[PDB]
């Protein structure tokens, strides 16, 4: 009995952690028509209904979202998909040429003085012998002066030439799902107060994550998830001043953006099978596009956020909000996309308040841009064709990104400013409750039994 | 009908019990291994990886002379130099992960002994059958 011999088992439930390539999965509903869109191509296998969830008990596991994989992976995938979609479209090389430009005095309000320019130039036709004279309109933030007479040139001409966007394509995001192949498992921590790093006792396993909607924004987050208990704050090392802070809300807030102006369209021929789209004529009075939010909602939400934040820097402290410090036009202002357009809104009127110890609507203006270089790359620009008719969309605000400014001694006061700029954090705000593990079926143990001859 | 529900036995979730109870429920896991332009290339890599992983385990089980079963005995004698404790505690209060981290260092030798043991067994049996 005391003496014993080794024994072998198979299919033992033990696992470790590693990394591997994931794959996609899309709802069949999207497969129903809608053949034109940057994402949501048909290669994704159709999903399956009635997902199942298995509960575990007596387990405890450590999570660390800061040093997490499968973030850069989907970042790279998104960039590659964008580049692939953009490939087959006409080029825009011949437009680099001197222009003759003037103002536009058509009952413009005083705030728009010099914000539209009427320009004309020469351009070759299909037959290489002839040339023709054409004209168009432009915004101030796309043309530059060089040196009486008046002349102007494009802004990207000396840097690079880039492709005009194809006409029929859709930028609307849709839900997507991530799934792992056989021989791997995906674990989720269901604790409703887990602060993003450390132990977690309540765990479960799944095969495919819930829906995800890729969105591009800065200084805010739109159409995210909603917490369940209260506003939560997350960070790597809150004591350090060089790391951003993510704030996730408990309830949503509503926002309305609109461009009341009206536009038409026109087409021009450049060469064999080469078309070009240009702005037409305006019909009536013109006004600046703008956005609205409520007042009381914002007030109470800020109050709750301050109250929650107070639990780290002592109750005897002062808080002051300040606008963006300053810099280039891409981080200093909140940029977003709605209906195939790009706005740039000045958020000076939202972080202007102070807090000490113990039906009106806020309206803000925006501006329009037509040449874009996103993902902070160089040598790759785009052209956005104009659209006809007014536009208006509505969305939800769900999260904020803040950065604490430096201080001196204990001045019983602190300041925060909006930050951001890197799109990694936007992905990181979602995939902080998922881990990937690998199985190890073999096993060995001693046993009193002995093999028979 | 009105109160009757459904209670199935799922994937790996018994990993919170003693060292012994878990072994009663193993078969299920064994039946879940071979389940079956840049946006679609990686699937081929995944499939190749999966099949290679399965084949490696099949071969390794084949060599040790225990293929076709889930519980197999052998002849190599255990040595207390590798580990301590008695049968009671081991099979009453422990978890598989704890054992894994316990025996991590001394694995290659334990693997190695089995094939030479099997080779001696086979060689002796061959002459036992061939002597007549």
């Amino acid at each position, epitope marked *: 009995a005391e003496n014993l011999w080794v024994t072998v088992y198979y299919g033992v439930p033990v696992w470790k952690d590693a990394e591997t390539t994931l794959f996609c999965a899309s709802d069949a509903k999207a497969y129903e028509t809608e053949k034109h869109n940057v994402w949501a191509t048909h290669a994704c296998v159709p999903t399956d209904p009635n997902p199942q*969830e*298995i*509960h*575990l*008990e007596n387990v405890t596991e450590e999570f660390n979202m800061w040093k997490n994989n499968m973030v850069e992976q989907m970042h790279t995938d998104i960039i590659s998909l964008w580049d692939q979609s953009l490939k087959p479209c006409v080029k825009l090389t011949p437009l680099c040429v001197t222009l003759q430009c003037t103002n536009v005095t058509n009952n413009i309000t005083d705030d728009m003085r010099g914000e539209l320019k009427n320009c004309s130039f020469n351009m070759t036709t299909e037959l290489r012998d002839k040339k023709q004279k054409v004209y168009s309109l432009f915004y101030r933030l796309d043309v530059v002066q060089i040196n009486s007479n008046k002349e102007y040139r494009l802004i990207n001409c000396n840097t690079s030439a880039c492709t005009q966007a194809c006409p029929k394509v859709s930028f609307e995001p849709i839900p997507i799902h991530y799934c792992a192949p056989a021989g791997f498992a995906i674990l989720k921590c269901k604790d409703k107060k887990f602060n993003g790093t450390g132990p977690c006792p309540s765990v479960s396993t799944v095969q495919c994550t819930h829906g995800i909607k890729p969105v591009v924004s800065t200084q805010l987050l739109l159409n995210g998830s909603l917490a369940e208990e209260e506003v939560m704050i997350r960070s790597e090392n809150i004591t350090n001043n060089a790391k951003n802070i993510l704030v996730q809300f408990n309830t949503p807030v509503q926002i309305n953006c609109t461009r009341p102006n009206n536009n038409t369209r026109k087409s021009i021929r450049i060469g064999p099978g080469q078309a070009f789209y240009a702005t037409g004529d305006i019909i009536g009075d013109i006004r600046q596009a703008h956005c609205n939010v409520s007042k009381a909602t914002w007030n109470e939400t800020l109050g709750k956020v301050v109250k929650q934040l107070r639990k780290h820097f002592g109750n005897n402290t002062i808080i002051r909000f300040a606008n963006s410090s300053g810099g280039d036009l891409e981080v200093t202002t909140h940029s977003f996309n709605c209906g195939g357009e790009f706005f740039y809104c000045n958020t000076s009127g939202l972080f202007n308040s102070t807090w000490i110890s113990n039906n009106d609507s806020i309206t803000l203006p925006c501006r329009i841009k037509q040449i874009i270089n996103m993902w902070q790359r160089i040598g790759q620009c785009m052209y956005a064709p104009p659209i006809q008719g007014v536009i208006r969309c509505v969305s939800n605000i769900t999260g904020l990104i803040l950065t604490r400014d430096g201080g001196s001694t204990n001045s019983t006061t602190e300041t925060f400013r909006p930050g951001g700029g890197d799109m990694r954090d936007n992905w990181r705000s979602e995939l902080y409750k998922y881990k990937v593990v690998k199985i190890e079926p073999l096993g060995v143990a001693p046993t009193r039994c002995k093999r028979r001859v | *009908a*009105v*109160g*009757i*529900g*459904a*209670v*199935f*036995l*799922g994937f790996l*979730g*018994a990993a919170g019990s003693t060292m012994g109870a878990a072994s009663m429920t193993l078969t299920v896991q064994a039946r879940n291994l071979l389940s079956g332009t840049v946006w679609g290339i990686k699937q081929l890599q995944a499939r190749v990886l999966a099949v290679e992983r399965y084949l490696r385990d099949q071969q390794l089980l084949g060599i040790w002379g225990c293929s076709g079963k889930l519980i197999c005995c052998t002849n190599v004698p255990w040595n207390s130099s590798w580990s301590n404790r008695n049968l009671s505690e081991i099979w009453d209060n422990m978890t598989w992960l704890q054992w894994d981290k316990e025996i991590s260092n001394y694995t290659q030798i334990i693997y190695g002994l089995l094939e030479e043991s099997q080779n001696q067994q086979e060689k002796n049996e061959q002459d036992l059958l061939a002597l007549d």
Partner: antibody, heavy 122, light 107 residues
Framework: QVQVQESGPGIVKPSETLSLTCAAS??????????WNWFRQPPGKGLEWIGG????????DYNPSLESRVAISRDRSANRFSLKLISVTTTDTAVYYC?????????????WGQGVLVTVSS | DIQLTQSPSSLSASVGDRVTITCRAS??????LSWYYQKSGEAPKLLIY???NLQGGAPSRFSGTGSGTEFTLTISSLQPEDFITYYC?????????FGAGTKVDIK
């Protein structure tokens, strides 16, 4: 092999509110849809039904007898559930049991309980 | 709703005899019923699942048959521990009705 237990106060007085709680363990099975039922045994009869509830949702289904007084809630934190009764009266003289049911492969075990005296009198 | 009748409603069956218990529903319930057995000092338990089907693990001493609104359980011999109350319960649309309770006494 699930073990289910109940508790409660002494002899409550009529015109007051009674409360009770029950705890059950998932035990051997991993994932399922365990169902819970509440019952009482008044003297001189058989059993009387006091409703039931699933283990996955707080929604409670009551019984025809006293629907304006019953209040059943599910405690997700500890896998528990509470049963409360307003306008208590001496008519509630009984021994209360807390039962649960699986659906294990067409066997349908049950672990009715042990009982607890919940009589009412001033 | 649905009402049932159990016979013998009050029988003091002498120990060591074959004993039969009949339960008849009011309206047809197809085949949806179960039988339970209970005694004081403990809680109720199940003796027959599905009625027509025999409960898994129940003693072979008890057997059951029936259909519709007529079912009958036969016990090959009355043990000392079998002097208990039996209930036929319909597993059909709401509400849920239980057996009247046929206590088996000693004589």
């Amino acid at each position: 092999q699930v073990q289910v237990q109940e508790s409660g106060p002494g002899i409550v007085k009529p015109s007051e509110t009674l409360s009770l709680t029950c705890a059950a363990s998932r035990g051997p099975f991993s994932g399922g849809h365990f169902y819970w039922n509440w019952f009482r045994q008044p003297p001189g009869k058989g059993l009387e039904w006091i409703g039931g509830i699933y283990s996955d949702g707080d929604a409670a289904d009551y019984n025809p007898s006293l629907e304006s007084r019953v209040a059943i809630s599910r405690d997700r934190s500890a896998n528990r559930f509470s049963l409360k009764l307003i306008s208590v009266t001496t008519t509630d003289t009984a021994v209360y049991y807390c039962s649960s049911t699986y659906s294990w492969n067409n066997v349908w075990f049950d672990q009715w309980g042990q009982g607890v005296l919940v009589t009412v009198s001033s | 709703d649905i009402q049932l009748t159990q016979s013998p409603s009050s029988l003091s069956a002498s120990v060591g005899d074959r004993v039969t218990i009949t339960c008849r529903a009011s309206q047809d319930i197809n085949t949806d019923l179960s039988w339970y057995y209970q005694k004081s000092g403990e809680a109720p338990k199940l003796l027959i699942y599905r009625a027509s089907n025999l409960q898994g693990g129940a003693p072979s001493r008890f057997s059951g048959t029936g259909s519709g609104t007529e079912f009958t359980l036969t016990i090959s011999s009355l043990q000392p521990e079998d002097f208990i109350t039996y209930y036929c319960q319909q597993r059909y649309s709401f509400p849920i009705t239980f057996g009247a309770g046929t206590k088996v006494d000693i004589k």
